[PDB]
RNA sequence: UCUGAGAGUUUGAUCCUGGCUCAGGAUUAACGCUGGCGGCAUGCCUAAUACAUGCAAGUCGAUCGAAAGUAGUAAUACUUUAGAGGCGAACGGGUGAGUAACACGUAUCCAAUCUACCUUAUAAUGGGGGAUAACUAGUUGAAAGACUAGCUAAUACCGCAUAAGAACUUUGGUUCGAAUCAAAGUUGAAAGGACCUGCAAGGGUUCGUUAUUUGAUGAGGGUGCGCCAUAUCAGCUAGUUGGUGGGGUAACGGCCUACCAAGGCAAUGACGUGUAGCUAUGCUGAGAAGUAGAAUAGCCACAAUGGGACUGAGACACGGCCCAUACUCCUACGGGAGGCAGCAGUAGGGAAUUUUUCACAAUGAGCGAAAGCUUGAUGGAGCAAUGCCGCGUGAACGAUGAAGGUCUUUAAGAUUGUAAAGUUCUUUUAUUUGGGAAGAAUGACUUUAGCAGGUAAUGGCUAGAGUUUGACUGUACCAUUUUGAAUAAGUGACGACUAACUAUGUGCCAGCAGUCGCGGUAAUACAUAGGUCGCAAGCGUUAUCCGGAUUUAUUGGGCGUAAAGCAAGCGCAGGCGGAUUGAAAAGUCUGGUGUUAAAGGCAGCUGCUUAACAGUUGUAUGCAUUGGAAAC
């Protein structure tokens, strides 16, 4: 919404998006493409997640760990 | 909200015609003083304006700084 | 009133009514607690008599309490 | 955890527990190995200054059933008052209610004190008490809520268990009073406090 | 607008919370909003709100459906992966003729007896074809329970990197499928309607018009409810066209048939 | 008693200069998974963008005329306000766009300032006139109202006279730019109300009016020093600078004006530009210091934008007045009404931060003599894991390890695990029944007695008893108060950085990550399973400032080869400087005094079951005067 757009990287097996969506963009940096220091955090208002990863659930948006 | 503000907006205007009487006639003597300096018009610029200074109209300052410039031209002679 | 929320707290402080509370004043003359009222009262009774000297009567709400300390009795001194 | 409920992990991983010794009663295998599987010739990744000193931390910690936070707004207090702060440390721990009441034989464990004392089966300086988050004073005493004095547990081990030497108590009317500071040297316990205190750089 | 379309989510998620008088749904083909109406006046009514209290632009759009497919049985085809990349040698022959079922699901046969490729790099490629079957190679139209028999293959010794036989899976599958000329899968439903049979006339020719097995009536001994079958492709705006010739005093309920093959005047509609 | 933690990384290996990240705390905080409970604290950082509706300061009949009512032929006792008049609306309440400057902070001076209302004493509260609202009448209209004639009253207004003291000018006492004290000329005061004693008589009593005299209060005014960046901003400036005369301000002054005259400030950074509410302080650091200036408190700033002015002691006024501008609302289109950066609340933005709430019980304010009235200040409630803190999901016996998972992958056995199965005890919380306080002995009212200048009395002050005020709350707390462990666990990591390992699937693919980097057929580094560890009703994730970081080095770094000694020289200003003596003491050292608010940092104490907290006892740099010391 405002003046700069910018490249992120997404995380996750798989993947939800595949064109003109919105979505939260967060700090951060990955050291496999050049300039690329943002990540699209999955559990956002459009994007779902990696529906499974128990391990690691505050990142990758899912829910708790199947009963 | 308010109830009684347009009381005094209407209480001032009279108040304020009274006030612009004094100082009129207030100038008025000034002008008698300031056309001809003597003892008699000064006395009756004193008679006519401290009953002006006594309320709140003209601070007392203004009056007193009025008569002494006054009576520096009185005894300018 | 100050302090804390169920546990009130006004201190008996010098001031001319002119502004809101907790801000400018002159003397701090003591303090009262209502939580626990037993005829007892943080009162310099030295400098309340410089204040009351100068104008700016306490708050209309101390003046049963000074009277049970005995302020009232040397302060009425000066009308006598 | 504030409670675990399940103190024999901990005992297993640590070599220690909380009494003498109750926590190998034989049923089945009696092992001093660290608990789960992970292999009965390792024993771990890194052995530094550290590990020690957390290992010592937790000892110390989980010995008394307390969280980290309070334990850090713990040293935070003692920072107030100086001194031997090394041996402070253990004597203000030990001022908490839990641990007096067992050192005056009225309970086993700190768990099963905390149990009684939340429920509302103490009395202390006729104020109900139900928390043992409070800092003993000397020259204080603890009642027991005569109307509560028949639990059978506290019946039972009143006589059955060992009075510390810096507390004293009428245990036929079930009352006990605080009479000094602890020591080291007069309760068991071979912890190097040195390390719980440097370890903690929050100060 | 997708803005446009982000609001009007937002409005109508409430709108929905304060007068339930219509459903909305949201189904992955492309990104379509599938709302119940009662006749054109719901939709004006809907639109109005939107635009005159959220302040919002939006122009409705067409009914966009899609059809399943199936192809041809070939008889050969050649995949070729040649490249000098990744550090290493990349490679793959790939040879499969590609047979879809209608009994069962997917299956994969392995048709290479002498082990000229190894077991490991099979399971792979399989998935790719699963991971292919999703998108054609004409639209990207579901292809749903059909069969590969990988017939011959060929790789590197050392080279033939895995990846590239999945990568090499769907190039070959789009070539000789542009030869294949795959035929559509239409979804057809049945239509239950409730008809006072004075006004069967107007109904029944609109279903002719549709595409539709019709020649006589089923009664229900006092009331006729035909059933009819039906294309899903033409029958929104055959909704609004039953309403008007019926004077509304008919109605009906959609239920899912089954999937049943298309004609010419379907298929040569695929393409643009 | 008090004051300083390291580790990884460039090369075959090593050293060195230098950079980056991790190991620390924290908020005006958000996101994902969850999810007992109390207290405290906190809750638009962005759009000073508009704002629906109601509420946001009124009061005085013991001030006045006019108008209704209760009962009473009349007089009347009381409740009311449409209006006049008086006081107060200039407070309180919020919001940070402009302002980089005596605005703020600090010590100060007003031989330049007013100060109603409160405190002190005093000359006193004399006498008349004319007034106009409401009301009555006539037009207009849907109301809205306005317009036009008539009558009224005062503490409203304007005159008549008396003055201690004041003001003004001459004469004489008198001062470290001016002031004291005498005689004289001049000149100006108002208004009554309530009550008592009296037949009337007058007098007294209470409020209050006017001229004073006192302090205090509050505001204003100029200066010292301190107080962002930028030289890719070199000259800025014309009421600007100064004399004279007048005007004017509350006073002093180009503050304004008429004449005359031409500097002021600057390289020690004007001026232009960018950014910004300042201060106590929050946070970090041992500190010098760095960062932001949320609550809270003081100051200024503005009130849709910009100009003005009246009112009053106090304004150029958050919700007074006029105009212009932009915007917005209603209308029977004649004309009107309006400003939530007051309280909640709505739109929009943003990732995002509360209910279109109960009462003046406590405090304050305004009026009133009081019963009292208004109080969106305030006291509360409620939402909001937003933070801090206590607090629970029980406790004690109970196998050669129940079943089973997992592993051992090769079973024999281990592990999950005293956890469980089972036994006993118990109810914070939960559910039900009862009692149920403090916060308020505050203010008045009425009966008693006393005090005082005083009287015949009535009124003001103190001592005594009774009337009561509680929104919160069925709160807290407890009670043979019923039941029963019952009603209550998550989240990150497990190669090393820094704590804890194994199996299966995955074959430089899917995929990981703050750092080193893993994965090309055995991944402890991916996915998942078991187990384990680090915190905890929270856990982790990104952004901000700090520490680490002597990584802007006064504390506490360098310039030969790594960045860095100008190409060299002459030198303005600045900075720094041979020895002896004297004088004062410009700083410094060292006392006293006054000033650095409150709250807050720090130490002790006290009541909150207890810590969280709150209150209290002290402490805290700096500034100016004053006396010593004269080594520098």
Same mark, same amino acid.
């Given at each position: ?67 | ?9 209407? @209480? !001032? ?5 009274? +006030? ?18 003597? $003892? ?7 008679? @006519? ?20 410039? +006054? ?7 | ?80 | 955890?504030?409670?675990? %409920? ?13 009494? #003498? ?30 590990? @020690? @000193? ?42 908490? $209610? ?21 429920? %509302? ?48 108590? +009428? +245990? =036929? ?31 | 607008?997708?803005?446009?379309? #982000? ?45 005159? #209290? ?17 192809? !041809? ?9 040649? =490249? ?120 029944? %020719? ?20 035909? =059933? ?39 298929? !040569?509609?695929?393409?643009?």
């Amino acid at each position: 919404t405002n003046g700069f757009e910018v490249l992120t990287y997404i995380p996750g097996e798989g993947h939800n998006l595949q064109e003109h969506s919105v979505t939260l963009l967060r700090g951060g940096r990955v050291k496999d493409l050049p300039g690329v220091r943002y990540h699209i955090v999955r559990g956002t208002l459009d994007t779902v997640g990696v529906e499974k990863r128990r391990q690691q659930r505050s990142a990758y948006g899912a829910k708790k760990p199947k009963a | 909200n308010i109830k009684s503000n347009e009381k005094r907006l209407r @209480q !001032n205007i009279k108040r304020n015609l009274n +006030n612009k009487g004094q100082k009129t006639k207030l100038k008025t003597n000034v002008k008698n003083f300031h056309k001809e300096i003597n $003892l008699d018009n000064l006395g009756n610029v004193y008679s @006519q304006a401290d009953r002006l200074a006594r309320k709140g109209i003209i601070s007392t300052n203004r009056a007193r700084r009025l008569k002494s410039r +006054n009576v520096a031209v009185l005894n300018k002679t | 009133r100050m302090g804390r929320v169920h546990y009130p707290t006004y201190r008996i402080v010098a001031v001319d009514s002119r502004v809101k509370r907790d801000g400018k004043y002159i003397a701090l003359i003591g303090h009262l607690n209502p939580a626990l009222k037993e005829n007892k009262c943080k009162i310099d009774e030295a400098v309340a008599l410089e204040w009351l000297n100068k104008g700016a009567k306490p708050t209309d709400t101390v003046r049963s309490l000074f009277s049970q300390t005995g302020l009232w009795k040397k302060f009425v001194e000066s009308k006598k | 955890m504030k409670y675990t %409920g399940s103190i024999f992990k901990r005992s297993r991983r640590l070599g220690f527990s909380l009494l #003498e010794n109750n926590k190998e009663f034989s049923k089945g295998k009696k092992r001093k190995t660290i608990p789960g599987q992970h292999g009965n010739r390792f024993r771990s990744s890194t052995m530094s200054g550290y590990a @020690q @000193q957390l290992q010592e931390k937790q000892r110390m910690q989980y010995m008394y059933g307390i969280t980290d936070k309070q334990f850090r707004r713990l040293f935070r207090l003692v920072l107030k008052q100086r001194g031997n702060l090394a041996v402070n440390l253990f004597r203000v721990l030990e001022s908490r $209610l839990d641990n007096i009441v067992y050192r005056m034989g009225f309970a086993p464990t700190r768990r099963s004190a905390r149990q009684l004392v939340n429920h %509302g089966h103490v009395l202390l300086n006729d104020r109900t008490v139900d928390t043992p988050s409070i800092i003993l004073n000397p020259g204080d005493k603890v009642r027991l809520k005569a109307k509560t004095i028949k639990i059978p547990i506290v019946k039972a081990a009143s006589e059955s268990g060992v009075v510390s030497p810096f507390v004293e108590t +009428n +245990n =036929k009317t079930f009352e006990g009073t605080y009479v000094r500071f602890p020591e080291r040297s007069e309760l068991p316990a071979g912890i190097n406090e040195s390390y719980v205190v440097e370890w903690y750089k929050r100060l | 607008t997708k803005a446009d379309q #982000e609001k009007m989510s937002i409005a109508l998620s409430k709108l929905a919370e304060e007068d339930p008088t219509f459903k909305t749904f949201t189904d992955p083909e492309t990104g379509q909003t599938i709302i119940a109406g009662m006749g054109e006046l719901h939709l004006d009514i809907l639109v109005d709100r939107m635009r005159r #209290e959220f302040k919002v632009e939006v122009n409705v759009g067409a009914p966009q459906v899609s059809f399943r497919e199936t192809f !041809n049985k070939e008889s050969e085809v050649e995949g070729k992966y040649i =490249k000098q990349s990744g550090g290493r040698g990349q490679y793959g022959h790939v040879k499969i003729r590609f047979e879809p079922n209608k009994d069962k699901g997917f299956e994969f046969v392995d048709k290479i007896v002498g082990g000229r490729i190894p077991r490991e790099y099979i399971k792979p490629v399989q998935a790719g074809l699963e991971n292919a079957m999703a998108s054609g190679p004409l639209a990207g139209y579901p292809m749903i329970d059909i069969k590969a028999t990988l017939f011959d293959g060929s790789f590197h010794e050392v080279d033939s990197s895995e990846m590239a036989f999945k990568i090499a899976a769907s190039l070959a599958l789009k070539e000789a499928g542009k030869v294949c000329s795959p035929v559509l899968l239409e979804p057809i439903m049945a239509i239950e309607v409730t008809v006072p049979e004075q006004y069967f006339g107007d109904t029944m %020719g609109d279903i002719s018009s549709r595409r539709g097995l019709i020649e006589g009536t089923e009664q229900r001994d006092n009331v006729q409810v035909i =059933k009819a079958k039906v294309p899903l492709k033409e029958m929104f705006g055959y909704a609004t066209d039953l309403r008007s010739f019926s004077q509304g005093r008919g109605n009906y309920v959609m239920q899912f048939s089954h999937y049943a093959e298309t004609p010419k005047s379907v298929v !040569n509609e695929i393409i643009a």
